[PDB]
Symmetry: C3
Subunit: 339 residues, 3 copies
């Protein structure tokens, strides 16, 4: 909600309270888990008009979990999602730095439209696919104001030597090219980076270089939203062997994401989605499936502030999965107030 | 403070900074402790008018402690208090889900009017008495718009298998009936729930079923506030044996709460209160008193935003208490700014 | 940003997103470190006019780090900076209590004007020099409205027995006298306090009494800012022996701080600074230098909301420093949006 608009500076303080339960037989060995998954969000988007052609902006977004106790475990799952400041000059584009989405999310965001789940490949703190800390991102709209609908972007990821290999990364470069024409939208994205010492010393994942690329195709006009994503990764996707407490990365993944949705004028947005992600050359296993499901779901928009939703995952993963990826269905019911 | 009111949606961003010190001889073995107890609060209440009869709402409330360092211990006592979203339809009532107060607090809230302390039985993360995560709560005002002042409510608590027994719970149902007539107010509340495996395996507290009930009686008009609460609990109230580092639950408790207050037009709200809570059938002890005090205190309201207060506990607990409950007096002095 | 101003109460919700990287050869053994140092800030200043002569106020300020992951380490460096409520009566002055700056910062704040670094002696959770929890602070402007530009202040620090000696303190008193005349400003500040048991049992630092004093001199008008600080400390400044994993306090320190800055109408604020801090009588060492550098830096103010800055530390510390204080240079580049 815009709560300040004075003297060439507007601030938007926004947030949401999401009442959210997950139903699954077991959670312990299912897709999403079982129990209370209530959370709250808070953030600000700030925007200042320095002059006629120059513009400043900043954003911060925090996640508070509503499913912890007030005791010892009160912070589990609480985190900053976004924290970046940036400048935008006329048609020369924009530069920002901080915690933000990796460039490959420029692609993957295409299918990340599900009411609760979806966008399984957009892992956070995972190089270029999701949110990451320490990214320089240049972005260009309409090719310096000369070619309508053509957008490109470049991103520089500074190394993050963290205490765990899962959240660590080295120096890297990535980028994306995208074009949008009369409802349609085509996107390509790629990025490569160094693996840290701690990532190399991991039982799963072999190499010194991590890669992630993904294409995007979508129709998004006249109340219809269709979208497709294909992606591959070298030494990038994080994997866990639940049979041995082993973790690391998958040498190769192929990732398919399909999404179909519709928006009725009265408020209903039903959702059908397909998602499959296979991992190749997993040491002491071979070929494992990590994500495999059909999705049926809906979202009722009472208005721009209030909504409820059901999201049903038909989990195609089988009972004898090599890595121990939960094979059971998960259903999520939600009530959202946002501002 | 209402900081947004546009297009059938109002947001209220509120919070408070509370400068608060506790004085006690020792803290280590007193009622409230000794030292700095400064804290800050922040939250939002959001409310949207979807249509003539339908209404959406959300709330989130966070607690930041102002008595930690900026070093390692910076998060101790920081937590989400409330996080829930909900709908309200004309006179059919309202449903909300998330982190909220258990239904039995509908009763206990009657005596929870002390400037600092009081409401000792309204334990948080303790089934139905205080705040809990994962509660479905239906609420009805004036019996579907037909019987003025008569309110009932039902609550469904989903299981919380936490890492500690103190904060855990199983599936349960609870409810409350309440009636308010010309200043007066009568309330009854009850709730039962499964104890988790980890709660069963505890040295203190025997059973598979936890119960909590409490009645309420109050006068609240013409500047006078009087209130009374009686409650009992099976396998619900958490207890600790400070002589052996044992914890668990008390098989039975009887809980008495009395409160008398007055509000002078110039700002002063003095407070007298009585509170006693005895535990029965404590294994290897028998009958222990957990809470036992008289309370004298006051609160000066400079206005709706500014206040100061003294709260003096005359701790009736004795020096030879079986469980080690601190027997010393505690005094709390406070300065509050709120918005 | 002022987001509420109704009925004798104004609220100012403010914050900043700071994109910030540090460049150093190694970080491991440099002044500021190397890598992403992105952070975000959020806080409120609240102010109410109770009556013609009486005024209430409150403040809370939180620090969110933007350089952590969303995993296990998500809270590292997150903390409350300020949390205090207070009253101000006409010319009789003001009293506040909570987490706030120690009185000696009244002095040291003189040189704490650097774009990123500087103010090295204003350690937080360190008695009277920086931010601390549990301080009663009386403050007087213009000597009860009788002597223009003459300000004094007294502060009472309640003991903080924390889990670490670094963040702990005992009971203490401190104060400051300050005078400001036609651009110029002179300040003196002093404070003494008990060391806790845990501080006494530390290998470094000998005594039962900790002291901190500092003078201030500044010119601050006509776009020029010059400032000087001299300080000494008994048993107050925290030190670490990186050669043995020893920590504690320095028996004596002498602290020099010099700062020169200018503000061009078009937005540029260049900065030159000198900072030296020597420790005397360090057990098993003798005389060690803790902080020793020249500073060159600038800050571009696009406006009151947007800015960028470079801060270059020329680290005069040598390679054979006895305590292991990093001797390498550190450069910090920043992009700030604030509101």
């Amino acid at each position: 909600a815009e709560i300040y608009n004075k003297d060439g500076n507007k601030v938007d303080l926004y947030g949401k309270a999401v009442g959210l339960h997950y139903f699954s037989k077991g959670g312990e060995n299912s897709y999403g888990g079982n129990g209370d998954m209530t959370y709250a969000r808070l953030g600000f988007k700030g925007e200042t008009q320095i002059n006629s052609d120059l513009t400043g902006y900043g954003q911060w977004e925090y996640n508070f979990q509503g499913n912890n106790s007030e005791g010892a475990d009160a912070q589990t799952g609480n985190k900053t999602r976004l924290a970046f400041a940036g400048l935008k000059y006329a048609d020369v584009g924009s530069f920002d730095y901080g915690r933000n989405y990796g460039v490959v999310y420029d692609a993957l965001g295409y299918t990340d439209m599900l009411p609760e789940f979806g966008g399984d490949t957009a892992y956070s703190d995972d190089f270029f696919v999701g949110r990451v800390g320490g990214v320089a991102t240049y972005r260009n709209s309409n090719f310096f104001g000369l070619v309508d609908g053509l957008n490109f972007a470049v991103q520089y990821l500074g190394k993050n030597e963290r205490d765990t290999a899962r959240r660590s990364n080295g120096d890297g470069v990535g980028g994306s090219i995208s074009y949008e024409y009369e409802g349609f939208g085509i996107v390509g994205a790629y990025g490569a980076a160094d693996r840290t010492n701690l990532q190399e010393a991991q039982p799963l994942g072999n190499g010194k270089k991590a890669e992630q690329w993904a294409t995007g195709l979508k129709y998004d006009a006249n109340n219809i939203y269709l979208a497709a994503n294909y992606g591959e990764t070298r030494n990038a996707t994080p994997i866990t062997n639940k049979f041995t407490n082993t973790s690391g990365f998958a040498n190769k993944t192929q990732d398919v994401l399909l999404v179909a949705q519709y928006q009725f004028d009265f408020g209903l947005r039903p959702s059908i989605a397909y998602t499959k992600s296979k991992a190749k050359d997993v040491e002491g296993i071979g070929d494992v499936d990590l994500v495999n499901y059909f999705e049926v779901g809906a979202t009722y928009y009472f208005n721009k502030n209030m909504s409820t939703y059901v999201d049903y995952i038909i989990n195609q993963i089988d009972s004898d999965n090599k890595l121990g990826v939960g094979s059971d269905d998960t259903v999520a019911v939600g009530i959202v107030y946002q501002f």
